Design an enzyme around this catalytic site. Structure first.
Site, PDB file in Angstrom:
ATOM      1  N   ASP A  69      -0.416  -7.594   1.841  1.00  0.00           N
ATOM      2  CA  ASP A  69       0.108  -6.232   1.739  1.00  0.00           C
ATOM      3  C   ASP A  69       1.634  -6.253   1.865  1.00  0.00           C
ATOM      4  O   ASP A  69       2.156  -5.996   2.946  1.00  0.00           O
ATOM      5  CB  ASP A  69      -0.523  -5.363   2.821  1.00  0.00           C
ATOM      6  CG  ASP A  69      -0.236  -3.883   2.722  1.00  0.00           C
ATOM      7  OD1 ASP A  69       0.342  -3.466   1.695  1.00  0.00           O
ATOM      8  OD2 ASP A  69      -0.578  -3.157   3.681  1.00  0.00           O
ATOM      9  N   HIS A 102       0.840  -1.196   0.000  1.00  0.00           N
ATOM     10  CA  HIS A 102       0.000   0.000   0.000  1.00  0.00           C
ATOM     11  C   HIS A 102       0.879   1.252   0.000  1.00  0.00           C
ATOM     12  O   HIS A 102       0.369   2.310  -0.344  1.00  0.00           O
ATOM     13  CB  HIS A 102      -1.007   0.046   1.148  1.00  0.00           C
ATOM     14  CG  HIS A 102      -0.514   0.463   2.490  1.00  0.00           C
ATOM     15  ND1 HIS A 102      -0.162  -0.443   3.471  1.00  0.00           N
ATOM     16  CD2 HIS A 102      -0.319   1.692   3.041  1.00  0.00           C
ATOM     17  CE1 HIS A 102       0.239   0.197   4.556  1.00  0.00           C
ATOM     18  NE2 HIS A 102       0.154   1.500   4.316  1.00  0.00           N
ATOM     19  N   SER A 116       3.552   2.736   8.288  1.00  0.00           N
ATOM     20  CA  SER A 116       3.295   1.861   7.175  1.00  0.00           C
ATOM     21  C   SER A 116       4.592   1.334   6.556  1.00  0.00           C
ATOM     22  O   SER A 116       5.482   2.124   6.280  1.00  0.00           O
ATOM     23  CB  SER A 116       2.512   2.520   6.020  1.00  0.00           C
ATOM     24  OG  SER A 116       1.182   2.807   6.384  1.00  0.00           O
TER      25      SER A 116
HETATM   26  N1  LIG Z   1      -3.275   1.868  14.010  1.00  0.00           N
HETATM   27  C1  LIG Z   1      -2.443   1.218  13.214  1.00  0.00           C
HETATM   28  N2  LIG Z   1      -1.801   0.139  13.645  1.00  0.00           N
HETATM   29  C2  LIG Z   1      -2.226   1.719  11.792  1.00  0.00           C
HETATM   30  C3  LIG Z   1      -1.154   1.370  10.998  1.00  0.00           C
HETATM   31  C4  LIG Z   1      -0.891   1.795   9.672  1.00  0.00           C
HETATM   32  C5  LIG Z   1      -1.684   2.662   8.917  1.00  0.00           C
HETATM   33  C6  LIG Z   1      -1.442   3.147   7.491  1.00  0.00           C
HETATM   34  N3  LIG Z   1      -2.231   2.314   6.582  1.00  0.00           N
HETATM   35  C7  LIG Z   1      -3.392   2.620   6.061  1.00  0.00           C
HETATM   36  O1  LIG Z   1      -3.912   3.694   6.326  1.00  0.00           O
HETATM   37  C8  LIG Z   1      -4.051   1.604   5.171  1.00  0.00           C
HETATM   38  C9  LIG Z   1      -3.762   1.863   3.703  1.00  0.00           C
HETATM   39  C10 LIG Z   1      -4.985   2.459   3.031  1.00  0.00           C
HETATM   40  C11 LIG Z   1      -6.154   2.301   3.977  1.00  0.00           C
HETATM   41  N4  LIG Z   1      -5.472   1.839   5.279  1.00  0.00           N
HETATM   42  C12 LIG Z   1      -6.148   1.771   6.437  1.00  0.00           C
HETATM   43  O2  LIG Z   1      -5.562   1.608   7.493  1.00  0.00           O
HETATM   44  C13 LIG Z   1      -7.665   1.847   6.637  1.00  0.00           C
HETATM   45  O3  LIG Z   1      -8.327   1.196   5.592  1.00  0.00           O
HETATM   46  C14 LIG Z   1      -8.845  -0.106   5.452  1.00  0.00           C
HETATM   47  C15 LIG Z   1      -8.031  -1.214   6.241  1.00  0.00           C
HETATM   48  C16 LIG Z   1      -8.203  -2.538   5.446  1.00  0.00           C
HETATM   49  C17 LIG Z   1      -8.366  -2.089   4.012  1.00  0.00           C
HETATM   50  C18 LIG Z   1      -8.418  -0.567   4.034  1.00  0.00           C
HETATM   51  C19 LIG Z   1      -2.760   3.013   9.717  1.00  0.00           C
HETATM   52  C20 LIG Z   1      -3.014   2.580  11.044  1.00  0.00           C
END
Ligand SMILES: N=C(N)c1ccc(CNC(=O)[C@@H]2CCCN2C(=O)COC2CCCC2)cc1
Ligand code: NA
Ligand code: NA
EC number: 3.4.21.5
Lengths: 27, 10, 251
Positions: free
Chosen positions: C99, C43, C198
Protein backbone atom coordinates in the site's frame (compact mmCIF):
# COMPACT_ATOMS: atom_id res chain seq x y z
CA UNK A 1 20.88 14.76 2.83
CA UNK A 2 19.93 17.20 5.63
CA UNK A 3 16.93 14.90 5.77
CA UNK A 4 15.34 14.12 9.08
CA UNK A 5 16.89 17.07 10.91
CA UNK A 6 14.19 19.48 11.96
CA UNK A 7 14.94 23.22 11.81
CA UNK A 8 13.11 23.95 15.05
CA UNK A 9 14.49 20.98 16.95
CA UNK A 10 17.61 19.01 15.88
CA UNK A 11 19.16 21.96 14.00
CA UNK A 12 18.84 24.08 17.20
CA UNK A 13 19.62 21.26 19.65
CA UNK A 14 16.13 21.48 21.10
CA UNK A 15 14.13 18.36 21.98
CA UNK A 16 10.40 17.95 21.50
CA UNK A 17 8.32 16.96 24.52
CA UNK A 18 8.05 13.22 23.91
CA UNK A 19 10.99 12.15 21.70
CA UNK A 20 12.73 10.83 24.80
CA UNK A 21 9.95 8.20 25.08
CA UNK A 22 11.14 6.82 21.73
CA UNK A 23 14.83 6.86 22.77
CA UNK A 24 14.03 5.01 25.98
CA UNK A 25 12.32 2.19 24.00
CA UNK A 26 15.44 1.59 21.90
CA UNK A 27 16.49 -1.10 24.36
CA UNK B 1 -16.66 22.74 3.94
CA UNK B 2 -15.29 23.23 7.44
CA UNK B 3 -12.19 24.28 5.55
CA UNK B 4 -11.02 27.81 4.94
CA UNK B 5 -10.95 28.69 1.24
CA UNK B 6 -7.53 28.54 -0.37
CA UNK B 7 -6.18 31.25 -2.68
CA UNK B 8 -7.87 30.93 -6.07
CA UNK B 9 -4.41 30.70 -7.64
CA UNK B 10 -4.08 27.09 -6.43
CA UNK C 1 -5.33 10.06 15.60
CA UNK C 2 -6.97 8.54 18.70
CA UNK C 3 -5.67 9.31 22.19
CA UNK C 4 -2.82 11.42 20.88
CA UNK C 5 -1.89 15.03 21.63
CA UNK C 6 -1.54 18.27 19.71
CA UNK C 7 1.75 18.40 17.78
CA UNK C 8 4.36 21.08 18.63
CA UNK C 9 5.06 23.66 15.92
CA UNK C 10 7.64 22.28 13.46
CA UNK C 11 7.58 18.85 15.17
CA UNK C 12 6.74 17.04 11.90
CA UNK C 13 7.86 19.26 9.04
CA UNK C 14 7.66 16.39 6.54
CA UNK C 15 3.90 16.07 7.24
CA UNK C 16 1.83 16.54 4.11
CA UNK C 17 -1.93 16.97 3.68
CA UNK C 18 -3.42 15.60 0.45
CA UNK C 19 -6.42 17.88 -0.23
CA UNK C 20 -9.35 17.45 -2.59
CA UNK C 21 -9.85 20.47 -4.86
CA UNK C 22 -13.65 20.11 -5.11
CA UNK C 23 -15.25 19.71 -2.67
CA UNK C 24 -12.33 21.07 -0.67
CA UNK C 25 -11.71 18.60 2.16
CA UNK C 26 -8.97 16.48 3.73
CA UNK C 27 -8.24 13.31 1.71
CA UNK C 28 -5.26 11.70 3.42
CA UNK C 29 -1.87 12.29 5.02
CA UNK C 30 1.47 11.93 3.28
CA UNK C 31 5.14 12.80 3.68
CA UNK C 32 7.80 14.91 2.05
CA UNK C 33 10.83 12.90 1.09
CA UNK C 34 12.60 15.56 -1.05
CA UNK C 35 11.83 18.95 -2.53
CA UNK C 36 9.75 17.32 -5.34
CA UNK C 37 8.53 13.91 -4.08
CA UNK C 38 5.75 12.98 -1.69
CA UNK C 39 5.08 9.49 -0.31
CA UNK C 40 1.62 8.30 0.60
CA UNK C 41 -0.60 5.20 0.76
CA UNK C 42 -1.92 3.78 -2.50
CA UNK C 43 -5.41 3.39 -1.05
CA UNK C 44 -5.53 7.22 -0.72
CA UNK C 45 -5.59 7.43 -4.44
CA UNK C 46 -6.99 4.13 -5.70
CA UNK C 47 -9.50 1.87 -4.03
CA UNK C 48 -12.07 0.40 -6.41
CA UNK C 49 -14.39 -1.11 -3.77
CA UNK C 50 -15.21 2.46 -2.75
CA UNK C 51 -15.14 3.89 -6.27
CA UNK C 52 -11.98 5.77 -5.31
CA UNK C 53 -9.66 6.65 -8.20
CA UNK C 54 -8.08 10.11 -8.07
CA UNK C 55 -6.04 11.67 -10.84
CA UNK C 56 -3.29 14.28 -10.62
CA UNK C 57 -5.56 17.22 -11.40
CA UNK C 58 -8.03 16.11 -8.70
CA UNK C 59 -5.67 16.98 -5.90
CA UNK C 60 -3.41 19.43 -4.11
CA UNK C 61 -0.56 18.88 -1.65
CA UNK C 62 -0.35 21.19 1.38
CA UNK C 63 3.02 21.29 3.20
CA UNK C 64 4.06 23.06 6.42
CA UNK C 65 0.62 22.84 7.99
CA UNK C 66 -0.40 22.74 11.61
CA UNK C 67 -4.03 23.72 11.51
CA UNK C 68 -6.36 21.23 9.84
CA UNK C 69 -8.94 23.64 8.36
CA UNK C 70 -7.16 27.02 8.27
CA UNK C 71 -5.27 28.44 5.30
CA UNK C 72 -1.93 29.10 7.05
CA UNK C 73 -0.79 32.16 5.21
CA UNK C 74 2.97 32.71 4.93
CA UNK C 75 3.54 29.26 6.45
CA UNK C 76 2.02 26.48 4.39
CA UNK C 77 2.92 25.86 0.78
CA UNK C 78 0.34 24.42 -1.63
CA UNK C 79 1.53 22.30 -4.55
CA UNK C 80 0.21 20.75 -7.76
CA UNK C 81 0.79 17.19 -8.91
CA UNK C 82 2.84 16.40 -12.00
CA UNK C 83 2.43 12.65 -11.70
CA UNK C 84 1.20 9.88 -9.44
CA UNK C 85 2.95 6.46 -9.22
CA UNK C 86 1.14 3.55 -7.56
CA UNK C 87 2.98 0.27 -6.77
CA UNK C 88 2.12 -2.09 -9.68
CA UNK C 89 1.50 -5.05 -7.22
CA UNK C 90 -0.58 -2.95 -4.81
CA UNK C 91 -3.17 -5.52 -3.62
CA UNK C 92 -6.44 -3.62 -3.16
CA UNK C 93 -8.44 -6.78 -3.75
CA UNK C 94 -7.44 -8.68 -0.67
CA UNK C 95 -5.29 -7.07 2.01
CA UNK C 96 -3.70 -3.79 0.89
CA UNK C 97 -0.35 -5.48 0.41
CA UNK C 98 2.19 -2.98 -0.96
CA UNK C 99 0.00 0.00 0.00
CA UNK C 100 2.33 2.72 -1.29
CA UNK C 101 2.35 5.45 -3.95
CA UNK C 102 4.65 8.31 -4.94
CA UNK C 103 3.59 11.77 -6.07
CA UNK C 104 5.81 14.12 -8.08
CA UNK C 105 5.27 17.88 -7.63
CA UNK C 106 5.03 20.29 -10.54
CA UNK C 107 7.69 22.45 -8.89
CA UNK C 108 10.17 22.06 -6.03
CA UNK C 109 8.91 23.23 -2.65
CA UNK C 110 11.00 25.67 -0.62
CA UNK C 111 12.21 24.26 2.70
CA UNK C 112 11.59 26.38 5.77
CA UNK C 113 11.27 26.06 9.53
CA UNK C 114 8.00 24.27 8.88
CA UNK C 115 8.85 22.37 5.69
CA UNK C 116 11.58 19.73 5.65
CA UNK C 117 12.03 16.20 4.26
CA UNK C 118 12.17 13.00 6.34
CA UNK C 119 14.77 10.31 5.69
CA UNK C 120 14.04 6.89 4.20
CA UNK C 121 15.70 3.97 5.92
CA UNK C 122 18.73 2.02 4.71
CA UNK C 123 18.94 -1.72 5.44
CA UNK C 124 20.97 -1.26 8.66
CA UNK C 125 18.75 1.42 10.19
CA UNK C 126 15.71 -0.75 9.46
CA UNK C 127 17.31 -3.80 10.98
CA UNK C 128 18.17 -1.96 14.18
CA UNK C 129 14.97 -0.01 14.63
CA UNK C 130 12.15 -2.30 13.48
CA UNK C 131 12.06 -4.42 16.63
CA UNK C 132 9.10 -5.37 18.80
CA UNK C 133 8.75 -2.87 21.66
CA UNK C 134 10.62 -0.05 19.95
CA UNK C 135 8.37 3.01 19.59
CA UNK C 136 7.69 5.08 16.52
CA UNK C 137 5.55 8.19 16.05
CA UNK C 138 2.44 8.65 13.93
CA UNK C 139 0.96 12.02 12.98
CA UNK C 140 -2.14 13.17 11.21
CA UNK C 141 -5.37 15.18 10.91
CA UNK C 142 -7.72 12.20 10.96
CA UNK C 143 -10.54 11.34 13.35
CA UNK C 144 -10.03 11.53 17.11
CA UNK C 145 -12.45 8.67 17.65
CA UNK C 146 -13.62 5.64 15.68
CA UNK C 147 -17.29 6.37 16.26
CA UNK C 148 -14.52 14.34 16.08
CA UNK C 149 -11.84 16.07 13.94
CA UNK C 150 -8.97 18.03 15.46
CA UNK C 151 -8.13 21.69 15.21
CA UNK C 152 -4.44 20.92 14.74
CA UNK C 153 -2.05 18.10 13.80
CA UNK C 154 -2.06 15.22 16.26
CA UNK C 155 0.79 12.97 17.39
CA UNK C 156 0.99 9.67 19.20
CA UNK C 157 3.91 7.38 20.01
CA UNK C 158 3.33 3.61 19.62
CA UNK C 159 5.34 0.42 20.08
CA UNK C 160 6.00 -1.98 17.23
CA UNK C 161 4.29 -5.28 17.92
CA UNK C 162 5.58 -8.81 17.46
CA UNK C 163 4.50 -10.35 14.15
CA UNK C 164 2.72 -13.35 15.82
CA UNK C 165 0.63 -10.96 17.91
CA UNK C 166 -0.10 -8.92 14.76
CA UNK C 167 -1.23 -12.02 12.91
CA UNK C 168 -3.34 -13.37 15.78
CA UNK C 169 -5.19 -10.08 16.15
CA UNK C 170 -6.92 -10.33 12.77
CA UNK C 171 -8.48 -12.66 10.18
CA UNK C 172 -6.76 -10.71 7.42
CA UNK C 173 -3.69 -12.20 5.76
CA UNK C 174 -0.66 -10.16 6.95
CA UNK C 175 2.42 -9.92 4.67
CA UNK C 176 6.16 -9.13 5.07
CA UNK C 177 5.38 -5.70 3.55
CA UNK C 178 3.37 -4.73 6.64
CA UNK C 179 4.05 -4.27 10.33
CA UNK C 180 1.69 -3.47 13.20
CA UNK C 181 2.00 -1.09 16.10
CA UNK C 182 0.06 -0.24 19.27
CA UNK C 183 -0.30 -1.07 22.93
CA UNK C 184 -1.67 -4.33 24.29
CA UNK C 185 -4.70 -4.33 26.59
CA UNK C 186 -2.38 -5.30 29.41
CA UNK C 187 0.06 -2.44 28.77
CA UNK C 188 -2.46 0.15 29.91
CA UNK C 189 -1.76 3.15 27.64
CA UNK C 190 -3.46 3.32 24.25
CA UNK C 191 -3.64 5.29 20.98
CA UNK C 192 -3.98 4.59 17.27
CA UNK C 193 -4.21 6.04 13.80
CA UNK C 194 -7.72 6.35 12.31
CA UNK C 195 -9.64 7.36 9.21
CA UNK C 196 -8.05 10.44 7.65
CA UNK C 197 -4.58 9.50 9.02
CA UNK C 198 -4.16 7.22 5.99
CA UNK C 199 -0.91 7.72 4.07
CA UNK C 200 0.81 9.61 6.90
CA UNK C 201 4.19 8.58 8.30
CA UNK C 202 5.26 6.29 11.07
CA UNK C 203 8.64 7.72 12.06
CA UNK C 204 11.46 6.81 14.38
CA UNK C 205 14.44 8.83 15.59
CA UNK C 206 17.69 6.99 15.00
CA UNK C 207 19.87 6.93 18.10
CA UNK C 208 22.92 6.51 15.84
CA UNK C 209 22.78 9.76 13.89
CA UNK C 210 19.82 11.55 15.55
CA UNK C 211 17.87 11.73 12.32
CA UNK C 212 14.18 10.98 11.78
CA UNK C 213 13.38 8.11 9.45
CA UNK C 214 10.06 7.05 7.95
CA UNK C 215 9.69 3.34 8.62
CA UNK C 216 5.95 3.06 7.95
CA UNK C 217 2.91 4.47 6.20
CA UNK C 218 -0.53 4.52 7.86
CA UNK C 219 -2.42 1.82 5.95
CA UNK C 220 -5.30 -0.01 7.65
CA UNK C 221 -6.89 -1.26 10.83
CA UNK C 222 -10.18 -2.64 12.09
CA UNK C 223 -11.86 0.12 13.99
CA UNK C 224 -9.56 2.62 15.76
CA UNK C 225 -7.88 2.08 19.15
CA UNK C 226 -9.78 -1.13 19.87
CA UNK C 227 -8.43 -3.37 22.65
CA UNK C 228 -6.63 -6.33 21.11
CA UNK C 229 -6.40 -4.71 17.65
CA UNK C 230 -3.39 -2.96 16.14
CA UNK C 231 -2.79 -0.47 13.38
CA UNK C 232 -1.10 -1.73 10.22
CA UNK C 233 1.67 0.15 8.39
CA UNK C 234 3.26 -0.33 5.02
CA UNK C 235 6.89 -1.45 5.56
CA UNK C 236 8.75 1.31 3.79
CA UNK C 237 12.18 -0.32 3.67
CA UNK C 238 10.71 -3.46 2.11
CA UNK C 239 9.47 -1.42 -0.82
CA UNK C 240 12.48 0.87 -1.07
CA UNK C 241 13.69 -0.67 -4.29
CA UNK C 242 10.49 0.32 -6.05
CA UNK C 243 10.82 3.77 -4.53
CA UNK C 244 14.34 4.29 -5.82
CA UNK C 245 13.51 2.93 -9.25
CA UNK C 246 10.65 5.40 -9.62
CA UNK C 247 12.66 8.40 -8.51
CA UNK C 248 15.70 7.32 -10.54
CA UNK C 249 13.65 6.63 -13.68
CA UNK C 250 11.49 9.74 -13.23
CA UNK C 251 14.10 11.88 -11.46
N1 LIG D 1 -6.90 1.83 13.29
C1 LIG D 1 -6.01 2.15 12.37
N2 LIG D 1 -4.71 2.08 12.63
C2 LIG D 1 -6.49 2.60 10.99
C3 LIG D 1 -5.71 3.29 10.08
C4 LIG D 1 -6.09 3.73 8.79
C5 LIG D 1 -7.34 3.56 8.20
C6 LIG D 1 -7.80 4.02 6.82
N3 LIG D 1 -7.67 2.89 5.89
C7 LIG D 1 -8.64 2.10 5.50
O1 LIG D 1 -9.77 2.27 5.92
C8 LIG D 1 -8.29 0.97 4.57
C9 LIG D 1 -8.53 1.35 3.12
C10 LIG D 1 -9.79 0.67 2.61
C11 LIG D 1 -10.18 -0.38 3.63
N4 LIG D 1 -9.25 -0.07 4.81
C12 LIG D 1 -9.42 -0.66 6.01
O2 LIG D 1 -8.82 -0.26 6.99
C13 LIG D 1 -10.30 -1.87 6.34
O3 LIG D 1 -10.27 -2.79 5.28
C14 LIG D 1 -9.51 -3.95 5.05
C15 LIG D 1 -8.04 -3.89 5.65
C16 LIG D 1 -7.15 -4.78 4.73
C17 LIG D 1 -7.80 -4.68 3.37
C18 LIG D 1 -9.08 -3.87 3.56
C19 LIG D 1 -8.12 2.87 9.12
C20 LIG D 1 -7.73 2.42 10.41
NA1 NA E 1 -5.05 -14.34 12.34
NA1 NA F 1 -5.54 -1.48 20.11
Amino acid sequence: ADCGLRPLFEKKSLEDKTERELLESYI
Amino acid sequence: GDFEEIPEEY
Amino acid sequence: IVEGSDAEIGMSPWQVMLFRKSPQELLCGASLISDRWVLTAAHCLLYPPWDKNFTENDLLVRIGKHSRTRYERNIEKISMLEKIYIHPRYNWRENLDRDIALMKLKKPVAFSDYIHPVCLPDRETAASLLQAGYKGRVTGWGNLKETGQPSVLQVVNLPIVERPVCKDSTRIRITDNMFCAGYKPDEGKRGDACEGDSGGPFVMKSPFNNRWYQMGIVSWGEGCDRDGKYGFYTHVFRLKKWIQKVIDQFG
